[PDB]
Design a protein around this ligand. Structure first.
Ligand SMILES: [Zn+2]
Ligand SMILES: [Zn+2]
Ligand SMILES: [Zn+2]
Lengths: 49, 64, 240, 147, 96, 79, 545, 42, 257, 115, 140, 148
RNA sequence: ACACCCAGCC
């Protein structure tokens, strides 16, 4: 979190690594944002079928 | 990662000019004049030495 | 190899420096792309990048190419280029490498950022001649990483039908993939029990021991008929 | 489309009045009429962008869909309802249903088609396989024989 | 009531490396945006410590000679993914 | 017998006949024509077809139930 | 099982790799890497009159190339040659089979996916070449629908002599020059060769003696006699048409028209002496006037390739293809072709004309908007007032785009390379030149203009209720001038629509095609010349009537 | 995404071919529309 | 006997490049001389690297590649050194190769620059040309690079490492008297540095009965050879190739009769 | 994988010959000199030198494939002059040219260095 | 081929042209036979080509426009016969698959969308029944 | 001596429709002896011409002044004194079409001879009495020299 | 195997 660039290098981690991913069984797993319809809002659609 | 020994296009030696180029830049020389003072006339060598990134400097931060 | 404007391309041939064209200054191109990639696709930004790269390399300054900059247009880049002793539109007189004759049409040449893609041929080339065969079908495996065979699909099958090359179609779909032999009873049409070592052929169900026919077929067809029998469907193999 | 009403109206040409619809032509005019109309409509689709396809291919398609008196769709509901062998139909689509129907009714596949022979690995009757070759003993006897 | 900080910030990470994107046919820009993800440079500085199942490292990456002001924040200057090439658009021997 | 099929020999018939004769030649069959040093079975079969000397009878199956025997020699070669 | 492992199944003796160009091969040849050739094998039957060659191949073994991988005895045992050092079993007898590495001249079916039409699986002759890619002549790229941007292609090697014979006699590339789909040559001259042969056959192309005998080296069907020069004094000079006359085979006769042929020239006094050299006349096998382009050398009915195929068979047309490609490429070494920024810039007068046209068009659109805003726009019959207004705006903007394009192309010099590729037909179109030079034009989504995605606005930057050209997606800038952000976004919308259509229509069209195939996979012409299906029901009493 | 009728592909192996590729993958959005329906693709 | 009578005038001659002019010569001969400059002048370059220890951030093949591209002085020894293929030794020997040794270990705090000056060679006549120096690799404390290399003799047709030139600027007919290149707008093109026209004129008048006769050269040496020696070796090598071809042709003619 | 060794562009291994002669039957007095392991360097000069010889009617060269290392030089001469003699004379003239150029270059270098 | 001079008078008897065309028409056989049914089918199968042949090899056109000689006319008749007999559909040719491929290959290039449906959607509309159309119309 | 046509022409106009090609120009010329009319495409880089220049056309079927058929092969190593010595612009081509003014009954009275010289075309209109040596598919030479 | 992603070419 608070490590500076030198501390990151000494710890064998790239300073330029953005992070934002988990490490599960050694695999860098990233969660992709999932789109969904907005909740709590009234929506009137055009079912013609 | 490191400066190429030779210009890819013509084959002029530019591996010995990276440190001199950095020193000239630290001497408040503009990039064009720094390249001219190093004898790089053809724009291929100027491309080679102007567009290079010294990634080995960052690679050397990690302990062996 | 791909540029920064969706201009793909595989390396077609590799010429040495003496074979490639060259300017009056001795500069030879590192890459030569066909003009015909430009007009249909209208990657004019590629050409502007080449011009701006020439101006940048000569001037010694990483030139700006932000999308919607109103201060940078083609005319200003051309005027800057003309000050360095080059043609304002970026063309140059190239000399034919093989003969040394001047090329009649002046070539558009300059620095452009190319990038090599992971799709390298050595990770794609693939061949097979009687490799390992999978369990269920006794057909070639799937994938280069198991010496698998290429799939001769439905549309290839129809294309060879249209050719009329029935023998090639048979060789592809029966002989080159999974030949097999079965023994079928003649009275009924069910696969029979053949002991080839003791030379005893019988069809339990008919009490038949002398009327048995040997039929060549793909192993996949045998599998289909065996699954059908397990599904209580009886494909009788009437050979007469 | 109300073709038969519009055709019967006063002061309306009953000769050149056509419809882009295909079912109305079949049910009003005839089977040959819908064949011709289908030909014209397919040609209109293909040659709208300037592309050209030889006439005989359109003729073959139109004849195939109108060979059996009624309009035969290029779908399961039109191809699998022909009198073809069960194996060709099961290779097309609805595979298990066709095989069940054949098993129940005891249909026999006469191996006359192409897919039937491909599945069984026999020489398909298609081009090079639509005939047989025989040895000519008399012609082999005569002439030169180096080895 | 509002003013854009700069219009060029409508593009994504992989479309911001394109120089002069507004002089391109938009399908070309889309394909390039799908292409830079396949270009190989130095994917991370500590590549000699990681053991990934696949990894590609270019010997001599170069920052583009024709830059975009947006890549000063994508760190494309420190981890480039290509080389500036003396490209000549010509029909030489028919092999292109 | 008043054969009704075309007297011309089809492309498919040419392909199959050349293939079969090449296979026969490769299996040490007697070549029916002199050869000036050709060793490829396909070339020998092609030469043996240029002359009307292939010993094969094409049996063309009419649709209904019947067949017709045409000597390769008594067909017009289309090349 | 049926569709996945019976109708189509994985096969042995198949290779796959990337394709790259090679203009030095014939149309019927395919370059094959050394490894691919050394991997797959072809089984030759040992005979008394080829036993020495096969014995040498066996002796060379699998290590060296060309060599053998297996010896199959008459009984059936298979001996592997990389596992047996003793020479006892390497003796060959008649009836033995030797599986040799495929070498030059072996026939191979060469396929690309999707396998759309019949010409997408043609036979080629293998030629062994150093590197690791399949190589194709540029002419065969059109039937395969293949480019060299990473396309991979399959190579099937027929195993027995019968299958090899029929691939040779039915489906080699020279035998498939003319498709039956539309009775036109499916292949043709393309890209560099087409642009350079448009340049070459221009009236003002004169070749010195040295260049002429350099070009004649690449002419395979050359009888060896150098033709009399068109100009004898004050210097021997051959014209381009004079060399192309040597390329043209036999004595074919053909008449065609160049793309730039004026319509009124036929009725004019100079009908048979074209001022523009636009009437292609090949008489007695010699090109005596005109400029060749896609309309006389491409995939068009009645082109020179079609006449060559229908006059001199298939082999001579193959040589014609290869000769055109090699000769024109080696002349292009001298002439050279290019495209640059200078080819996308018009005169200042042209830019002023385009700007004035766009200003007038915008003024007209504002006038129509004002007329409709006061309910002074009478709707056209058969359309609503909104539809009438949209039609008027679209017609005005289309007229503006057409006028700007015409003004752009009026100013292109003969040396412009955009026009060089457009008139030759090699690549590009007049619309592309107009878009690059003058105006990209209107951007359409689902046929209409840019919709009001926001609350009655195309983008937040416009005011509500703005039907003008800029708001609804009329890109008034050219590609050279650069698009402003709003019209950049609208252009992105149009391009996305194109991509969606390309990526969606495949999944409909492939299913339509497959259904059409399986509807009539068995219909064929039987031996009484009738067309019947598998049930012997006559579909047509004669094929095509 | 659920117990061991659930979303799939919510978590993916981070793309480490190029730094631009990593950044692009870390900023991706997915629409659960099936893979038909040209309107959401526009 | 229809051989030409070429003449040479040398304009500039420094330690880096030679700028000369050839008159009364075919275009083909001048072009072939240029191609021989680029690709058929032998020099000595590192071609066999064996690495004992390499703890640097650069893998072994990278170090070998950067070693191969270092130019080595090849003034007079390249003539007396035989190709490794033609030599009778088993693998390598002093008569057909030159031995180099590099042994660097960084134990100081600051970074160590393994440059070309660390390439110690047994033969005193073959050294890296920079003896600022060519950078081979940068080393952090605790990292060592210890390797031994052998330099063969070769020319540019094999690999670009054996290229002695650093851009051969070749020009002929600086003003289009021959119209070998057609300018669509001649006024826009800069004049060549060898041009002989005033400001008003853009290109020379067309010469219908002219051929390429004067060729301007600028052979810039990377450092392996002096530029004059590059040109002399090029001419000698082309002469030797032609003489070998003549010998083979004579043998073939005598065998065919 | 299939990358050829770099030295095959200029080296003859056991089996090939540097030059071969093949009479051309299409026209009288013509030869097809096939030279292995060469390129345009020795093709262009030979063609240009042959073009000067007034008794040489045709003189061209081609490289059948840029990946194959082989050139084919076709020479057709007057009836009273053999093509092989034309080839030998062309090579001799080229050698004389290059010797003279080398000598003059050495003299010019000496003059420039001296002053 | 025969170096026919289009200026000098020709030696081709128009009766020879008539006889030659009539004789050639009997060699271009698509439906061989003798009975009236086969004869009518043969006449119909080559009606258009026979009309074109009689129009092009007309007596006046050959005498005035083309001006071929007797040898040239005989060669022309031989060539027409040879080229026609080479154009007859070979038995065993799978024309069904060929036609399906020929109609399905353009489908890959056509785009989607008074309004009249066209392109791939209309092809779906046509090859199916489609008991409910998309855009019915009547060209009255 | 094989001289099919012989006259002196005045260059009345050059490229009336514009500069169609850079190196080739179309001369519209009119004679005065036989009063003919010659459109002719000539190379300009190797042989310039100006408006109002007199030049002699000696269009002939053979340069060897013996009637021996040349057969149309380049023979630069020929010593016999051909006709291409007294003219400074020699061209070779094929007469590819001959038009006229024929009716159904009357004979030709005004003939046009079209000759293609490897691409450079020429039309020669005049009285039929002069254009008799011209024949379709006949190979001819065109000889030009300017007159001071 | 199986499943799921990603990606290539149309
Ligand atoms: Zn350089
Ligand atoms: Zn039984
Ligand atoms: Zn040694």
């Amino acid at each position: 979190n608070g490590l500076t660039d030198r501390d990151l290098c000494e710890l064998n981690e790239c300073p330029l690594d953005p992070g934002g991913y988990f490490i599960i069984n050694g695999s860098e797993k990233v969660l992709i944002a999932q789109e969904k319809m907005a909740t709590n809002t009234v929506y009137v659609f055009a079912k013609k079928d | 990662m490191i400066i190429p020994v030779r210009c890819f296009t013509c084959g002029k030696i530019v591996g010995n000019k990276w440190e001199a180029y950095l020193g000239l830049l630290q001497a408040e020389y503009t990039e064009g004049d720094a390249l001219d003072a190093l004898g790089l006339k053809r724009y291929c060598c100027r491309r080679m030495l102007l567009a290079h990134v010294d990634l080995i400097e960052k690679l050397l931060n990690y302990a062996p | 190899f791909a540029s920064r404007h969706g201009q793909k391309g595989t390396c077609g041939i590799q010429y040495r420096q003496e074979d490639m064209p060259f300017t009056c200054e001795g500069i030879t191109p590192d890459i030569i792309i066909n003009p015909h990639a430009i007009p249909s696709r209208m990657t004019i930004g590629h050409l502007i990048e080449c011009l701006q790269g020439k101006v940048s390399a000569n001037k010694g300054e990483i030139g700006d190419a932000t999308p919607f900059n109103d201060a940078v247009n083609v005319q200003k880049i051309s005027n800057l280029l003309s000050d360095y002793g080059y043609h304002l539109r970026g063309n140059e007189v190239l000399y034919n490498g093989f003969t040394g004759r001047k090329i009649t049409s002046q070539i558009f040449i300059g620095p452009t950022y190319y990038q090599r893609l992971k799709h390298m041929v050595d990770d794609k080339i693939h061949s097979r001649a009687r490799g390992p065969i999978q369990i269920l079908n006794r057909q070639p495996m799937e994938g280069r990483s198991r010496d698998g065979g290429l799939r001769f699909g439905e549309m290839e099958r129809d294309c060879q039908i249209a050719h009329g090359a029935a023998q090639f179609l048979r060789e592809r779909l029966f002989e080159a993939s999974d030949p097999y032999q079965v023994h079928v009873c003649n009275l009924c049409g069910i696969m029979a029990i053949a002991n080839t070592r003791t030379h005893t052929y019988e069809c339990r169900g008919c009490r038949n021991k002398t009327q048995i026919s040997l039929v060549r077929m793909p192993y996949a067809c045998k599998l289909l008929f065996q699954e059908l029998m397990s599904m209580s469907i009886a494909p009788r193999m009437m050979s007469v | 489309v109300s073709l038969m009403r519009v055709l019967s109206e006063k002061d309306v040409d009953p000769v050149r009045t056509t419809s882009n619809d295909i079912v109305e032509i079949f049910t009003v005019l005839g089977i040959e009429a819908v064949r011709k109309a289908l030909e014209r409509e397919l040609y209109h689709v293909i040659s709208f962008d300037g592309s050209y396809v030889n006439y005989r291919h359109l003729a073959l398609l139109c004849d195939t869909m109108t060979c059996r008196g009624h309009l035969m769709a290029i779908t399961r509901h039109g191809v699998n309802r022909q009198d073809t062998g069960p194996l060709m139909k099961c290779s097309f689509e609805e595979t298990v249903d066709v095989l069940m129907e054949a098993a129940a009714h005891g249909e026999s596949d006469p191996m006359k088609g192409v897919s039937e022979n491909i599945m069984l690995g026999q020489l398909a009757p298609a081009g090079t396989g639509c005939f047989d070759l025989l040895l000519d003993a008399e012609k082999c006897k005569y002439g030169m024989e180096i080895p | 009531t509002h003013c854009e900080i700069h219009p060029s910030m409508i593009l994504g990470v992989c479309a911001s490396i394109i120089p002069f994107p507004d002089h391109n046919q938009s399908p070309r820009n889309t394909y390039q945006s799908a292409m830079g993800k396949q270009a190989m440079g130095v994917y991370i500085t500590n590549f000699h410590v990681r053991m990934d199942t696949l990894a590609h490292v270019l010997y001599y990456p170069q920052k583009p000679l024709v830059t975009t002001r947006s890549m000063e924040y994508l760190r494309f200057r420190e981890l480039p993914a290509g080389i500036n090439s003396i490209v000549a658009i010509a029909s030489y021997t028919g092999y292109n | 017998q008043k054969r009704i099929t075309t007297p011309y020999m089809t492309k498919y018939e040419r392909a199959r006949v050349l293939g079969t004769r090449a296979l026969q030649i490769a299996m040490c069959a007697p070549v029916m024509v002199e050869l000036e040093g050709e060793t490829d079975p396909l070339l020998i079969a092609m030469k043996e077809l240029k002359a009307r000397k292939i010993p094969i009878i094409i049996r063309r199956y009419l649709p209904d139930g019947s067949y017709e025997d045409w000597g390769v020699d008594e067909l017009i070669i289309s090349d | 099982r049926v569709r996945g492992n019976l109708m189509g199944k994985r096969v042995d003796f198949s290779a796959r790799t990337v394709i790259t160009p090679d203009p030095n091969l014939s149309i019927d040849q395919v370059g094959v890497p050394r490894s691919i050739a050394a991997n797959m094998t072809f089984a030759e039957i040992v005979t008394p009159f080829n036993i020495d060659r096969l014995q040498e191949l066996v002796r060379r073994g699998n290590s060296q190339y060309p060599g053998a991988k297996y010896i199959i005895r008459d009984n059936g045992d298979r001996i592997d040659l990389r596992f047996h050092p003793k020479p006892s079993d390497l003796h060959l007898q008649t009836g033995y089979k030797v599986e040799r590495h495929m070498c030059d001249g072996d026939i191979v079916i060469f396929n690309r996916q999707p396998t759309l039409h019949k010409m997408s699986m043609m036979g080629h002759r293998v030629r062994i070449l150093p590197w690791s890619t399949f190589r194709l002549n540029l002419s065969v790229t059109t039937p395969y629908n293949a480019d060299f941007d990473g396309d991979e292609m399959n190579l099937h090697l027929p195993q027995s002599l019968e299958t090899r014979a029929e691939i040779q006699e039915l489906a080699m590339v020279p035998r498939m020059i003319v498709t039956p789909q539309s009775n036109r040559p499916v292949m043709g001259i393309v890209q560099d060769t087409l642009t350079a042969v448009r340049k070459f056959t221009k009236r003002d192309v004169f070749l010195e003696r040295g260049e002429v005998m350099n070009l004649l080296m690449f002419l395979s069907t050359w009888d060896g006699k150098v033709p009399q020069p068109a100009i004898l004094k004050p210097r021997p000079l051959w014209t381009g048409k004079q060399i192309f006359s040597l390329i043209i085979p036999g004595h074919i006769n053909c008449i065609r028209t160049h793309s730039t042929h004026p319509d009124d020239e036929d009725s004019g006094p100079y009908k048979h002496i074209s001022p523009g050299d636009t009437k292609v006349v090949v008489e007695n096998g010699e090109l005596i006037m005109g400029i060749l382009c896609k309309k006389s050398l491409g995939t068009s009915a009645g082109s020179l390739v079609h006449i060559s195929y229908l006059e001199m068979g298939h082999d001579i047309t193959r040589l014609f293809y290869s000769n055109i490609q090699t000769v024109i490429n080696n002349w292009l070494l001298i002439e050279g072709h290019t495209i640059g920024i200078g080819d996308s810039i018009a005169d200042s007068k042209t830019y002023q004309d385009i700007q004035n046209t766009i200003k007038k068009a915008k003024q007209d659109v504002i006038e129509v908007i004002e007329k409709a805003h006061n309910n002074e726009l009478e709707p056209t019959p058969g359309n609503t007032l909104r539809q009438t207004f949209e039609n008027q705006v679209n017609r005005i903007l289309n007229d503006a785009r057409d006028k700007t394009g015409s003004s752009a192309q009026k100013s292109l010099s003969e040396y412009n390379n955009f026009k060089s590729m457009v008139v030759s037909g090699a690549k590009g179109s007049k619309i592309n030149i107009s878009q690059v030079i003058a105006v990209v034009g209107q951007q359409n989504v689902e046929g209409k203009r840019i919709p009001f995605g926001f609350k009655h606005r195309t983008l937040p930057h416009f005011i509500k209720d703005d039907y003008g050209p800029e708001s609804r997606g009329f890109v008034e800038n050219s590609y050279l001038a650069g698009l402003t952000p709003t019209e950049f976004f609208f252009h992105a919308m149009g391009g996305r629509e194109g991509l969606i259509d390309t990526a969606v229509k495949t999944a409909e069209t492939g299913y339509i095609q497959r259904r059409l195939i399986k509807s009539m996979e068995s219909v064929m012409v039987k031996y009484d010349a009738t067309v019947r299906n598998s049930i012997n029901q006559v579909v047509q009493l004669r094929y095509g009537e | 995404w659920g117990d061991q009728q659930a979303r799939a592909g919510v978590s993916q192996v981070l793309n480490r071919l190029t730094f631009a590729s990593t950044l692009s993958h870390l900023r991706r959005l997915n629409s659960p529309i099936g893979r038909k329906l040209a309107k959401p693709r526009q | 006997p229809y051989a030409n009578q070429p003449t040479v005038r040398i304009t500039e001659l420094t330690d880096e490049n030679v700028k000369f002019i050839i008159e009364n010569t075919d275009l083909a001969v001048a072009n072939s001389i240029r191609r021989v400059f680029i690709a058929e002048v032998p020099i000595i370059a590192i071609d066999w690297v064996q690495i004992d220890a390499n703890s640097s951030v650069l893998h072994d093949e990278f170090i070998a590649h950067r070693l191969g591209l270092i130019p080595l002085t090849s003034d007079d020894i390249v003539d007396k050194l035989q190709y490794s293929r033609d030599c009778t030794c088993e693998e390598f020997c002093p008569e057909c190769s030159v031995e180099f040794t590099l042994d660097v270990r960084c134990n100081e705090d600051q970074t160590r620059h393994v440059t070309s000056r660390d390439l110690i060679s047994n033969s005193p006549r073959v050294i890296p040309v920079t003896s600022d120096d060519i950078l081979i690799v940068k080393l952090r404390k605790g990292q060592e690079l210890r390797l031994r290399a052998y330099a063969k003799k070769g020319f540019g047709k094999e690999h670009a490492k054996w290229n002695p030139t650093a851009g051969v600027a070749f020009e002929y007919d600086p003003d289009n008297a021959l119209r070998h290149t057609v300018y669509p707008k001649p006024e826009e093109w800069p004049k060549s540095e060898y041009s002989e026209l005033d400001e008003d004129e853009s290109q020379a008048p067309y010469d219908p009965n002219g051929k390429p006769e004067r060729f301007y050269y600028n052979v810039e040496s990377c450092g392996s050879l002096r530029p004059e020696t590059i040109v002399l070796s090029a001419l000698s090598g082309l002469k030797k190739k032609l003489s070998d071809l003549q010998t083979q042709l004579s043998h073939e003619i005598q065998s065919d009769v | 994988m299939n990358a050829p060794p770099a030295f095959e562009s200029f080296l003859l291994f056991e089996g090939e010959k540097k030059i071969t002669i093949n009479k051309d039957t299409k026209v009288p007095n013509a030869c097809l000199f096939t030279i292995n392991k060469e390129d345009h360097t020795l093709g262009n000069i030979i063609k240009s030198q042959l073009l000067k010889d007034p008794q040489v009617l045709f003189a061209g060269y081609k490289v059948p494939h840029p990946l194959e290392h082989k050139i084919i030089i076709r020479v057709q001469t007057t009836p009273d002059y053999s093509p092989q003699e034309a080839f030998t004379n062309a090579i001799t003239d080229l050698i004389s040219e290059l010797s003279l150029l080398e000598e003059r270059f050495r003299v010019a270098i000496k003059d420039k260095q001296e002053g | 081929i025969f170096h026919i001079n289009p200026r000098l008078p020709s030696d081709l008897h128009p009766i020879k042209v008539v006889e030659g065309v009539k004789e050639l028409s009997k060699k271009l056989v698509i439906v061989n036979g003798d009975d009236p049914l086969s004869r009518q089918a043969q006449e119909n199968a080559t009606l258009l080509f026979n009309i074109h042949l009689r129009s092009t090899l007309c007596s006046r056109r050959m005498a005035e426009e083309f001006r071929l000689s007797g040898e040239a006319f005989d060669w022309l008749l031989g060539e027409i016969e040879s080229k026609f007999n080479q154009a007859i559909a070979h038995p065993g040719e799978m024309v069904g698959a060929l036609a399906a491929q020929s109609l399905g290959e353009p489908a890959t290039q056509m785009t989607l969308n008074k309004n009249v449906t066209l392109g791939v959607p209309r092809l779906k509309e046509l090859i199916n029944i489609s008991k409910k159309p998309k855009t019915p119309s009547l060209t009255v | 001596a094989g001289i099919l046509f012989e006259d002196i022409f005045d260059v009345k106009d050059i490229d009336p429709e514009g500069k169609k090609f850079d190196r080739v120009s179309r001369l519209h010329c009119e004679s005065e002896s036989f009063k003919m009319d010659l459109i002719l495409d000539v190379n300009i880089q190797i042989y310039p011409v100006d408006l109002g220049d007199k030049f002699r056309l000696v269009i002939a079927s053979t340069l060897y002044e013996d009637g021996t058929l040349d057969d149309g092969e380049y023979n630069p190593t020929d010593d016999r004194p051909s006709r291409a010595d007294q003219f400074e612009y020699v061209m070779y081509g094929k007469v590819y079409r001959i038009e006229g003014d024929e009716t159904s009954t009357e004979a030709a009275t005004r003939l046009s001879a079209y000759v293609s010289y490897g691409g450079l075309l020429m039309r020669l209109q005049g009285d039929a009495n002069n254009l008799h040596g011209f024949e379709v598919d006949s190979r001819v030479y065109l000889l030009m020299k300017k007159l001071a």
